[PDB]
Design a protein around this ligand. Sequence first.
Ligand SMILES: Cc1ccc(NC(=O)[C@@H]2CCCO2)nc1
Ligand SMILES: [Zn+2]
Ligand SMILES: [Zn+2]
Length: 580
Amino acid sequence: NLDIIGKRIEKIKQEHETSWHYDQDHPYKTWAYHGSYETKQTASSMVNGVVRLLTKPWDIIPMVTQMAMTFKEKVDTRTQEPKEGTKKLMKITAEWLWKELGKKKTPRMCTREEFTRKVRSNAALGAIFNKWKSAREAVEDSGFWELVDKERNLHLEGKCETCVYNMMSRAIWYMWLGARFLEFEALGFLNEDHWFSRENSLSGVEGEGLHKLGYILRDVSKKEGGAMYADDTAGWDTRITLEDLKNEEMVTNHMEGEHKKLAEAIFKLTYQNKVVRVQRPTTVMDIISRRDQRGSGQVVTYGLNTFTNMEAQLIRQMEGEGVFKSIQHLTVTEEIAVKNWLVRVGRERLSRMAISGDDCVVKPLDDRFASALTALNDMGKVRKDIQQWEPSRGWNDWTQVPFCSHHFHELIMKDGRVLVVPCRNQDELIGRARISQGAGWSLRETACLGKSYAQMWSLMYFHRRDLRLAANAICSAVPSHWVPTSRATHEWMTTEDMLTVWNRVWIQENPWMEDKTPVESWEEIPYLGKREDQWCGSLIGLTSRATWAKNIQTAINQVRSLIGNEEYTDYMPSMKRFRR
Ligand SMILES: Cc1ccc(NC(=O)[C@@H]2CCCO2)nc1
Ligand SMILES: [Zn+2]
Ligand SMILES: [Zn+2]
């Protein structure tokens, strides 16, 4: 308690000594509360006019138009301590998993140099605005790094002064850039050196790309076993237990020297003890603390979520295979049996999974997995939208399985080669491309964001009639040389010809494609079946859509007139119906 968080708490008091008060009407049950002080402040979703003017049929589809309009009673909940047998299963599995992940990787500190290059090319590091304006400016000022040094030497001393969370089924905990640096220095290696790549972790898909996920799920489907399970957890970050945080911290057992001490301090001082500021309109700032739940930077959050999910799913596989009888207590000989299972089949059982943070797909040895719920419930990883003791419903076809907000189609090219393509309901794709975040967008910057969406569509959703047409329209409407912008692998963020990029991604660099014959035109690249395209949300067959497609050059010219006298290319004749 207060010997680890007091100093952060003490320091905040003094900066608002005029305003401090232990409010007696505080809403917190599960968070420890310390005091309150005076503030007054809050960023809505803005519409991208370039994308909207070129998707007119969708202006009357509420599933699209409602996306641009507009649980903190899940953060204020508690998770019970797991049973002794569950705690033993988790410790053995976590110890074994950090060893496996460490066999071909070397933990190492990330550098000021590396951190500086990140900020100077826009990565969402979840910092706050004070002394300097932006992240770019703080990193170029030696005073900042002296603040970093003071904290850093404080962490080597096993103490913390300035690493404080700011709160804002989502919850993003911003810290000041300095605290983010110290997190990146100690634990950035997990992401920077690809610890959760599929090659290194067997279950992971870190860095794989949306064009590979479908092929990965089809490879899982080829294994002998039961149904494919894809159970979502209800509020994963809120169900991370102190026992989870202690098993995650065992990565420090693989470290040495300074790095070991710096990482032990991030885990002890910022993860296993936390200090948070929350805006309450009743507008004061509340300073609350708790030991458990996830509240790290989003990139460290991804890797540790992947780790703990891999651990949880291996234990649920052990339960279905009858490796242990009860979570109440592991006998001495069940411990040897669990250890022996991991050594003997651990790597095979990891390859039966695709895991991206809290999101998983598991093809277990058989369907006993479906009703193996005691370890999963007791670890606090309670399934969403199913009763606690009701057996999981599995998927019989890898093309029906949800993963990373998509499903995957098998699409055969006119030349017989096989594409496995990502897909989701087309209203979600068009509704997201119509939204921008943040203020002060010029018309040029808005156009370049529309171009990023259009290029992603050409690369990942070319098989959807309406998106290949809308992508061609947007690329025809935005000046040819203007560079796509945004505020896993993003191959569409380029000014290279999209047919050349398509060839590189789907043919040349695609390890599931044996014949490397380049495609010469977009007309060789297939669509879904017309009925499948409608099932997944196409407007093909509607009067509104036919008028849009027929008159698309008039829409392209409306946008060109707004942007002005610039160099444009006509990409519409890449499509058969516009090719005269
Ligand atoms: C593991 C993984 C890899 C890729 C993706 N998603 C994407 O690349 C796109 C960018 C915009 C939303 O979808 N999601 C998960
Ligand atoms: Zn600190
Ligand atoms: Zn689909």
